[PDB]
Design a protein around this ligand. Structure first.
Ligand SMILES: [Mg+2]
Ligand SMILES: [Mg+2]
Ligand SMILES: [Mg+2]
Ligand SMILES: [Mg+2]
Ligand SMILES: [Mg+2]
Ligand SMILES: [Mg+2]
Ligand SMILES: [Mg+2]
Ligand SMILES: [Mg+2]
Ligand SMILES: [Mg+2]
Ligand SMILES: [Mg+2]
Ligand SMILES: [Mg+2]
Ligand SMILES: [Mg+2]
Ligand SMILES: [Mg+2]
Ligand SMILES: [Mg+2]
Ligand SMILES: [Mg+2]
Ligand SMILES: [Mg+2]
Ligand SMILES: [Mg+2]
Ligand SMILES: [Mg+2]
Ligand SMILES: [Mg+2]
Ligand SMILES: [Mg+2]
Ligand SMILES: [Mg+2]
Ligand SMILES: [Mg+2]
Ligand SMILES: [Mg+2]
Ligand SMILES: [Mg+2]
Ligand SMILES: [Mg+2]
Ligand SMILES: [Mg+2]
Ligand SMILES: [Mg+2]
Ligand SMILES: [Mg+2]
Ligand SMILES: [Mg+2]
Ligand SMILES: [Mg+2]
Ligand SMILES: [Mg+2]
Ligand SMILES: [Mg+2]
Ligand SMILES: [Mg+2]
Ligand SMILES: [Mg+2]
Ligand SMILES: [Mg+2]
Ligand SMILES: [Mg+2]
Ligand SMILES: [Mg+2]
Ligand SMILES: [Mg+2]
Ligand SMILES: [Mg+2]
Ligand SMILES: [Mg+2]
Ligand SMILES: [Mg+2]
Ligand SMILES: [Mg+2]
Ligand SMILES: [Mg+2]
Ligand SMILES: [Mg+2]
Ligand SMILES: [Mg+2]
Ligand SMILES: [Mg+2]
Ligand SMILES: [Mg+2]
Ligand SMILES: [Mg+2]
Ligand SMILES: [Mg+2]
Ligand SMILES: [Mg+2]
Ligand SMILES: [Mg+2]
Ligand SMILES: [Mg+2]
Ligand SMILES: [Mg+2]
Ligand SMILES: [Mg+2]
Ligand SMILES: [Mg+2]
Ligand SMILES: [Mg+2]
Ligand SMILES: [Mg+2]
Ligand SMILES: [Mg+2]
Ligand SMILES: [Mg+2]
Ligand SMILES: [Mg+2]
Ligand SMILES: [Mg+2]
Ligand SMILES: [Mg+2]
Ligand SMILES: [Mg+2]
Ligand SMILES: [Mg+2]
Ligand SMILES: [Mg+2]
Ligand SMILES: [Mg+2]
Ligand SMILES: [Mg+2]
Ligand SMILES: [Mg+2]
Ligand SMILES: [Mg+2]
Ligand SMILES: [Mg+2]
Ligand SMILES: [Mg+2]
Ligand SMILES: [Mg+2]
Ligand SMILES: [Mg+2]
Ligand SMILES: [Mg+2]
Ligand SMILES: [Mg+2]
Ligand SMILES: [Mg+2]
Ligand SMILES: [Mg+2]
Ligand SMILES: [Mg+2]
Ligand SMILES: [Mg+2]
Ligand SMILES: [Mg+2]
Ligand SMILES: [Mg+2]
Ligand SMILES: [Mg+2]
Ligand SMILES: [Mg+2]
Ligand SMILES: [Mg+2]
Ligand SMILES: [Mg+2]
Ligand SMILES: [Mg+2]
Ligand SMILES: [Mg+2]
Ligand SMILES: [Mg+2]
Ligand SMILES: [Mg+2]
Ligand SMILES: [Mg+2]
Ligand SMILES: [Mg+2]
Ligand SMILES: [Mg+2]
Ligand SMILES: [Mg+2]
Ligand SMILES: [Mg+2]
Ligand SMILES: [Mg+2]
Ligand SMILES: [Mg+2]
Ligand SMILES: [Mg+2]
Ligand SMILES: [Mg+2]
Ligand SMILES: [Mg+2]
Ligand SMILES: [Mg+2]
Ligand SMILES: [Mg+2]
Ligand SMILES: [Mg+2]
Ligand SMILES: [Mg+2]
Ligand SMILES: [Mg+2]
Ligand SMILES: [Mg+2]
Ligand SMILES: [Mg+2]
Ligand SMILES: [Mg+2]
Ligand SMILES: [Mg+2]
Ligand SMILES: [Mg+2]
Ligand SMILES: [Mg+2]
Ligand SMILES: [Mg+2]
Ligand SMILES: [Mg+2]
Ligand SMILES: [Mg+2]
Ligand SMILES: [Mg+2]
Ligand SMILES: [Mg+2]
Ligand SMILES: [Mg+2]
Ligand SMILES: [Mg+2]
Ligand SMILES: [Mg+2]
Ligand SMILES: [Mg+2]
Ligand SMILES: [Mg+2]
Ligand SMILES: [Mg+2]
Ligand SMILES: [Mg+2]
Ligand SMILES: [Mg+2]
Ligand SMILES: [Mg+2]
Ligand SMILES: [Mg+2]
Ligand SMILES: [Mg+2]
Ligand SMILES: [Mg+2]
Ligand SMILES: [Mg+2]
Ligand SMILES: [Mg+2]
Ligand SMILES: [Mg+2]
Ligand SMILES: [Mg+2]
Ligand SMILES: [Mg+2]
Ligand SMILES: [Mg+2]
Ligand SMILES: [Mg+2]
Ligand SMILES: [Mg+2]
Ligand SMILES: [Mg+2]
Ligand SMILES: [Mg+2]
Ligand SMILES: [Mg+2]
Ligand SMILES: [Mg+2]
Ligand SMILES: [Mg+2]
Ligand SMILES: [Mg+2]
Ligand SMILES: [Mg+2]
Ligand SMILES: [Mg+2]
Ligand SMILES: [Mg+2]
Ligand SMILES: [Mg+2]
Ligand SMILES: [Mg+2]
Ligand SMILES: [Mg+2]
Ligand SMILES: [Mg+2]
Ligand SMILES: [Mg+2]
Ligand SMILES: [Mg+2]
Ligand SMILES: [Mg+2]
Ligand SMILES: [Mg+2]
Ligand SMILES: [Mg+2]
Ligand SMILES: [Mg+2]
Ligand SMILES: [Mg+2]
Ligand SMILES: [Mg+2]
Ligand SMILES: [Mg+2]
Ligand SMILES: [Mg+2]
Ligand SMILES: [Mg+2]
Ligand SMILES: [Mg+2]
Ligand SMILES: [Mg+2]
Ligand SMILES: [Mg+2]
Ligand SMILES: [Mg+2]
Ligand SMILES: [Mg+2]
Ligand SMILES: [Mg+2]
Length: 46
RNA sequence: AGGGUGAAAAGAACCCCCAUCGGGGAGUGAAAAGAACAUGAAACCGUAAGCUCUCAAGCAGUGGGAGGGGGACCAGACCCUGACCGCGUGCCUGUUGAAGAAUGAGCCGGCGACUCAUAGGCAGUGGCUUGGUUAAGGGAACCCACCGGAGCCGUAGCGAAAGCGAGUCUUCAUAGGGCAAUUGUCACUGCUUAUGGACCCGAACCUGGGUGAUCUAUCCAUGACCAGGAUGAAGCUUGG
RNA sequence: AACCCAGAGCUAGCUGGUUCUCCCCGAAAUGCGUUGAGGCGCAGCAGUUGACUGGACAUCUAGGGGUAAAGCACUGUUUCGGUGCGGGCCGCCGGUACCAAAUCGAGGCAAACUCUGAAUACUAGAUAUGACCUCCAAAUAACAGGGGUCAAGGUCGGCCAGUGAGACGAUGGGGGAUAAGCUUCAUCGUCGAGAGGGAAACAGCCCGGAUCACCAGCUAAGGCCCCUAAAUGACCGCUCAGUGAUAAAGGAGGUAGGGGUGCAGAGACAGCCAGGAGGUUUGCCUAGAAGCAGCCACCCUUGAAAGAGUGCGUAAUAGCUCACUGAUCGAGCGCUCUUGCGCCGAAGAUGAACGGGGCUAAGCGGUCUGCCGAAGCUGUGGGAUGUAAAAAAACAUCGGUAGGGGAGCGUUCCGUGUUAGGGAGAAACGCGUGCGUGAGCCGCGUUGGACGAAGCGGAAGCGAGAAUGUCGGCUUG
RNA sequence: GACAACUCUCUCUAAGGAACUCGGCAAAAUAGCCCCGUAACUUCGGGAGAAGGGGUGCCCCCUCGGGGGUCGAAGUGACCAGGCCCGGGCGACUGUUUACCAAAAACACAGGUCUCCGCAAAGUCGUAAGACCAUGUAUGGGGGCUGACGCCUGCC
RNA sequence: CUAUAACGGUCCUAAGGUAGCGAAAUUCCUUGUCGGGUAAGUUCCGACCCGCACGAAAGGCGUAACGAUCUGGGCACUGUCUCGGAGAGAGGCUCGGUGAAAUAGACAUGUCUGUGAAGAUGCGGACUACCUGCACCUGGACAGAAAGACCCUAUGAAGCU
RNA sequence: CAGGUAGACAGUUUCUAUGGGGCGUAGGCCUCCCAAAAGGUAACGGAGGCGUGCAAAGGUUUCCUCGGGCCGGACGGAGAUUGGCCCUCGAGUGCAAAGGCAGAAGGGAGCUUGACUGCAAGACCCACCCGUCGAGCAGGGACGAAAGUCGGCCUUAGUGAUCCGACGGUGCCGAGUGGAAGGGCCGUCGCUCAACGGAUAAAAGUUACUCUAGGGAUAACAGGCUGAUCUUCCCCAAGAGUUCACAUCGACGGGAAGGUUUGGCACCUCGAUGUCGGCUCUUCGCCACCUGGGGCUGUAGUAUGUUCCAAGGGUUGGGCUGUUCGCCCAUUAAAGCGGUACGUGAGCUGGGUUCAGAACGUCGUGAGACAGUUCGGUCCAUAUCCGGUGUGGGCGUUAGAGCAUUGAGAGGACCUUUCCCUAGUACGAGAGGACCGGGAAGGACGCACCUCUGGUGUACCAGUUAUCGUGCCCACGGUAAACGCUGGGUAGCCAAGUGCGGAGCGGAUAACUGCUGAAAGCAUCUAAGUAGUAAGCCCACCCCAAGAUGAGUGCUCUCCUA
RNA sequence: UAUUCUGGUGUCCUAGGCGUAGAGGAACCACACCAAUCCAUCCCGAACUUGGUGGUUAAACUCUACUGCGGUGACGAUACUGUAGGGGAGGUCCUGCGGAAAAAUAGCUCGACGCCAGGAU
């Protein structure tokens, strides 16, 4: 055998998970319409 | 190495277990503090009561908490236990890097290491700045009032030096260049530096002075010892 | 080179150890010199303190250069070609198809070659508000400006540290075997000194830099059959090898596609029927060579077609069969590439060993949308440090080893003090639904039996888990 | 007490007989006494207990060893008590030695040879005084190398 | 005749190894080659000489006797062995009495494989495993008994030349 | 007092990196490359130089152009001197290399001494110490008509801090004062201080007699990484093989795997994590030595050759070695190769770490030394845990028991050689001589066993020696360790003795051989579907076995009294 | 003031150079010829020097023209690369955003600009 193996960090570089697919990279958080302005949390009644 | 019964031996009569020791009562005493006696932590050894483990894999915990128990007054809380699920590669040292199969610690409690003196530098605080300060020494014993200006720091530099001096050395030349044309000090506290063992513990050694020949190495004096058996040199006498 | 004592706490650039808490900042493993290499001096890069400053992050322009690429103008190198002085062999002063400089033509190569020559990098200059609340303009919005606050780089010094064994990864290279988790340099990233998520586990790969609380929310990297959070989602293609965990040359009617080129409707491929002749037994060679041991030639004729013969066969013939042609059959078929995914090549030593179970998708490409996913970001509350000099209110900030700075707690003792308090129970010992960022404090006792706080100050034999420490006590076996 | 494995101190083991093993390590074997016999080799002393063989108890009889009988599987019946032979190296020999991992081929040795020393000697120990050498005197005393006996000991 | 070299030439030294021995306690290559002993011989004996690198008082070559010497072979003999067996004692084992030690971070202390400072009970994935004794066995725990004798360092120590 | 002179004696020194051994080599400076177009930059990376030289090779004024082709010219030739045309920087420049430089920095001529004194703004380089460039100013000059140039050299190497001394100068100091001695200052000289930032003026070895503190920051073994070397293949096919590349070989080259050889690395442990052989004891891999089944053959037969599947079993006994290796003897079916830390040292034992003694050869003056040889030479261990082989208790198994079993799972064993029928039949001209299927005897191994043959048999029985007891004879007893010594021996235990075992027209496969048969109207062992077939795999055989917590099923028994 | 021409003299530059063909003699520049007291040749009045002649555009220089050589040289695209990733056992390949050659060809090129003296218009 004239080929080596992948030890330690080398091996990590090779084997770590990646999304190659151009479509999954370009995804993102959903865009939800804004919320109507909400009331005051707690009010003091005197 | 081995300290502390009580104020006082009042150190426990008498009965019981009973060969003695040891104990349980009674009695002494504020207390038994009962002679292995004063406070009496930890390791370690147990005894009892509450919950719980015998299909289980785990640096023993932690977040969640089934079921069961306990002392409450803010009874929806606290405390003990712990069905099962999740997460969780002892500590130190030292390393590019450790859970390491890298070193170190059996466990528990004590002892155990940047100290002191004196100087130098710097910082922080004061005191004086009619410059600052005293050293040894003297002191109603110490401390301390009051002394003690000898010293020391700051007020002029340049130059090897004579020497000159707000200048001076280098120069034929100030022509240029160099260096100068100003500055507090005495304490206390801290950080560092230096000198002494100088953060602690740890060598093999080095030298000086003694002590050893009852062991062993040689010898010296004077004693003692070596069962039993073989073999048969010289020499000597016999005779060719 | 005895022993004991003394100098002696010898000396040890070496190894081990060096004890309370919280807050802020925070490295280096490089260069030079060294009887130096595991030490040290200075520099580089901490911290704290002052003095000057005006930047940094971006944007554009300008400089010089000789790397990457490229090239043959020089220096080498090199192949063949053209021409050839120059040499070898022969003759007798005669011959040739033999080796060869320079130049030409063609074609290359180069760390120590350059007529050329980038990108970045370096040096320099010039252009441009970092955010947030307010005032605001008849005034609303926005814009403009005033005002206020905050954040942000650098040189020179003072005081005073560590560091001077680095590791891998990306990239450029040298040594080595374009071997090594090897080694040695250069520009960077992470680890060192960095927790969290993804990587089955997994210093150095990817995301992200942890003030703290929350049984809230949105996301990054990465994921969505069950173990195990989210789609047993959607729509296109592919794979049949459990490929989906790894390796090459090479092999191949594997398979799904794409592109050229042959033919054909007077019938193309395969099958089946027949023919496959004459010269001639071609010449040579040979005992023989007759298509078929070997050598050379490989034409011609009759023809629908038939090679002086593709293979078998004979001692040599014969014989079988192929190339090619007519017929039959009636719609595709030939030989070429080339992608994608597979197959074989592919074989080790304790036992599935490639996360498991499993899956023809739960594998692989391509496209669409939901969700999960961290200590990142948001939400709601507390703390601290810097502005900063009381607050309060802002804004920013708060990972951290070596290491530096700030703020504290506790122990014994002294001053106040022959203190307050204490046989109406001190110290100590044991406890706490008490209060602190912690060191700890405050309170309580069916223990204990005589001392002794707080405050405001002072001093140290002042804090222990590590020293094969050390002395006692007690285990384990 | 019991009578496992295994270890150790011991006895025995069919057929074989060193095949074991680094190596016959350890075991087994031999063994006294009397009688016969006894090699190479030699420094003529040895070798030599060479090797190898026979006999052995208890009774009577004869002579002062011999004959006859008789038991036993076995008679020096236990204990005690040599295995031997053929070779080679090294060292002549008996001796000495590393207390506690080495007993030898190392050390010694008789012998050899060199050299110093005439006596108030050389040599050794003492700062010195002096002591040893030696109450000796070159057939003696120091020191160096070699190592019986045999053959020798070459060149520079 | 292949060969070898008594014999010559030259070189250099103070001079160039004579007698005797020789694969040896000396021989590297090397288990030299030959002969013997053995069914088979890296040892042994004899001889060759090509003495890496014998040699003449650091003695050379012989040698009878001697040796708890080193080394080869042979007869006798045997559990040394083929290939183990049985027995006796002292332990081991049970019961009563007395009663240690080295060791020890804490240990609730499986296997395979993978990972990892590159050989894991302790991290991952599977697999296997009721709790706990006793007798035996010694593969592991990088098992235990402190400076690693070997290698390097130290401007260490000592002895010796 | 002086000179000489003994490691007899004393104190000390003996560098760093080599390949972390000897040995010689290297250590400062300069140029080029590496060096990634600023500068800087390492390697035991690749090339070379320097430790000076010139009185002109310096200064200046002024003039000039080298080299290389081709041609002419007495000797004279390839090449000397001379003439001429073409190319234009290819020569030169004291000496390396680099960068420069053509009416020049290159060649010549004339005059010289600036190869000056006093200096110096500012820069570059920079840890420091050093190092480099320099406009400008004054003095006194050289050359030049003058402008101007000149503080050595086209540039970059040609060097050495400090202390100390030496010579020449000097308006300085001069220990009461005057002088002197001696010093200061300026100029300069003196080290291969070359280990070149120089430790002193002055310095080598050795330790296996050794020791201390440390680290393996650095090796020796093993582990890991790597795989050059090694081992096993595959690709191409020049040929060989009567014809014929591919029965069998396969040159020139290529592509791999493995991790067993010799290595590289230094990640690993240094304290007591240690190499090669045997003994005992396993176990696993397959690249298959034999045994089972096949394909091809240049296979007639027997026997081969090569290759495919196959690791269930097997793989002897000796002479020789420290050995891995290897050689032989006699067998054998065959006497396989590897891994497991030499697999195995808290299981055993030899060497090896050649420890201290000694001797030989050799090196060294020497102490001593040797990957030379030789003789001698101490490794301990009561098992805590895991792991194992056995053997119990507890508890579970849903009321408690006693028996009998099913069998998930686990193991043991299924091995092999001759000979004889078949048949001297096929096969072959003969010589030779089968496949297939039957039968016996053996081997090894396993399971038992004691009838026989034995071994032991300290239960016993007999002889017998010495001796002391029982009063003495007789006869017995003790002792001669754990039989005094011998001769026998039953039961037990045991083997060399005796038996027995290895069975399967069961199941499913590997290779291979096949039948029907498409995709490609042909063919094809395969795509559908099936048939044969292996010492292999699984059931059957033999023991264990419901803690098989999934704790099974069956039969029976017992649950009183108040 | 212009313009044209000759000679001198510079600066800028794309470095204007060689070749072929043509033009210039009144002026200007040059050679040609002749003689050597200043000076001159390592030999030579060749060069350099002083003083004459009056010949010629032959050489030289000058001016116009021309791509044959020479010099210069794109646009595009490609190689390379900065940064953000991806593939491969590796040697090395690929993508996005930004920069961007060398070579080769297409073209360009027979310089530009200024002062002085001297003629001519
Ligand atoms: Mg490999
Ligand atoms: Mg991984
Ligand atoms: Mg995403
Ligand atoms: Mg009483
Ligand atoms: Mg009594
Ligand atoms: Mg009493
Ligand atoms: Mg009472
Ligand atoms: Mg009372
Ligand atoms: Mg008490
Ligand atoms: Mg279970
Ligand atoms: Mg458990
Ligand atoms: Mg470590
Ligand atoms: Mg370490
Ligand atoms: Mg301790
Ligand atoms: Mg320990
Ligand atoms: Mg203390
Ligand atoms: Mg200190
Ligand atoms: Mg002090
Ligand atoms: Mg005495
Ligand atoms: Mg005495
Ligand atoms: Mg005595
Ligand atoms: Mg006497
Ligand atoms: Mg006596
Ligand atoms: Mg006697
Ligand atoms: Mg001593
Ligand atoms: Mg001390
Ligand atoms: Mg002292
Ligand atoms: Mg010292
Ligand atoms: Mg910070
Ligand atoms: Mg050091
Ligand atoms: Mg700083
Ligand atoms: Mg440029
Ligand atoms: Mg260039
Ligand atoms: Mg290039
Ligand atoms: Mg190129
Ligand atoms: Mg060229
Ligand atoms: Mg060309
Ligand atoms: Mg280059
Ligand atoms: Mg150019
Ligand atoms: Mg250009
Ligand atoms: Mg840029
Ligand atoms: Mg350094
Ligand atoms: Mg280093
Ligand atoms: Mg790296
Ligand atoms: Mg490069
Ligand atoms: Mg290569
Ligand atoms: Mg560190
Ligand atoms: Mg970081
Ligand atoms: Mg990051
Ligand atoms: Mg943040
Ligand atoms: Mg933060
Ligand atoms: Mg979401
Ligand atoms: Mg789910
Ligand atoms: Mg789906
Ligand atoms: Mg797979
Ligand atoms: Mg035929
Ligand atoms: Mg899976
Ligand atoms: Mg969160
Ligand atoms: Mg947090
Ligand atoms: Mg938080
Ligand atoms: Mg945050
Ligand atoms: Mg605050
Ligand atoms: Mg604040
Ligand atoms: Mg404040
Ligand atoms: Mg912090
Ligand atoms: Mg710190
Ligand atoms: Mg107190
Ligand atoms: Mg007190
Ligand atoms: Mg308190
Ligand atoms: Mg009282
Ligand atoms: Mg103290
Ligand atoms: Mg105990
Ligand atoms: Mg017994
Ligand atoms: Mg006996
Ligand atoms: Mg026997
Ligand atoms: Mg016999
Ligand atoms: Mg013996
Ligand atoms: Mg015996
Ligand atoms: Mg006899
Ligand atoms: Mg004899
Ligand atoms: Mg011998
Ligand atoms: Mg002797
Ligand atoms: Mg001894
Ligand atoms: Mg002896
Ligand atoms: Mg001796
Ligand atoms: Mg005398
Ligand atoms: Mg001797
Ligand atoms: Mg021999
Ligand atoms: Mg040998
Ligand atoms: Mg032998
Ligand atoms: Mg020799
Ligand atoms: Mg001699
Ligand atoms: Mg003899
Ligand atoms: Mg003796
Ligand atoms: Mg037995
Ligand atoms: Mg006993
Ligand atoms: Mg357990
Ligand atoms: Mg690994
Ligand atoms: Mg493992
Ligand atoms: Mg765990
Ligand atoms: Mg064990
Ligand atoms: Mg044992
Ligand atoms: Mg462990
Ligand atoms: Mg040193
Ligand atoms: Mg020293
Ligand atoms: Mg000495
Ligand atoms: Mg650069
Ligand atoms: Mg550079
Ligand atoms: Mg270098
Ligand atoms: Mg000159
Ligand atoms: Mg001037
Ligand atoms: Mg010159
Ligand atoms: Mg000096
Ligand atoms: Mg005087
Ligand atoms: Mg005077
Ligand atoms: Mg005086
Ligand atoms: Mg005087
Ligand atoms: Mg001067
Ligand atoms: Mg030095
Ligand atoms: Mg130096
Ligand atoms: Mg010196
Ligand atoms: Mg020795
Ligand atoms: Mg010593
Ligand atoms: Mg290991
Ligand atoms: Mg082939
Ligand atoms: Mg290391
Ligand atoms: Mg150990
Ligand atoms: Mg196979
Ligand atoms: Mg045949
Ligand atoms: Mg097999
Ligand atoms: Mg097997
Ligand atoms: Mg086998
Ligand atoms: Mg057979
Ligand atoms: Mg072995
Ligand atoms: Mg072991
Ligand atoms: Mg010698
Ligand atoms: Mg011995
Ligand atoms: Mg146990
Ligand atoms: Mg039950
Ligand atoms: Mg049964
Ligand atoms: Mg079954
Ligand atoms: Mg089971
Ligand atoms: Mg069977
Ligand atoms: Mg027949
Ligand atoms: Mg048969
Ligand atoms: Mg029997
Ligand atoms: Mg019987
Ligand atoms: Mg018997
Ligand atoms: Mg009697
Ligand atoms: Mg008796
Ligand atoms: Mg089948
Ligand atoms: Mg077939
Ligand atoms: Mg068909
Ligand atoms: Mg099928
Ligand atoms: Mg079968
Ligand atoms: Mg049951
Ligand atoms: Mg159940
Ligand atoms: Mg141009
Ligand atoms: Mg132009
Ligand atoms: Mg003309
Ligand atoms: Mg042109
Ligand atoms: Mg372009
Ligand atoms: Mg990239
Ligand atoms: Mg350009
Ligand atoms: Mg171009």
């Amino acid at each position: 055998s004239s080929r080596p193996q992948k030890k330690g960090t080398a091996h990590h570089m090779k084997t770590r998970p990646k999304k190659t697919a151009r479509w999954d990279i370009k995804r993102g958080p959903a865009v939800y319409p804004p919320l109507p302005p909400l009331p005051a949390e707690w009010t003091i009644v005197s």
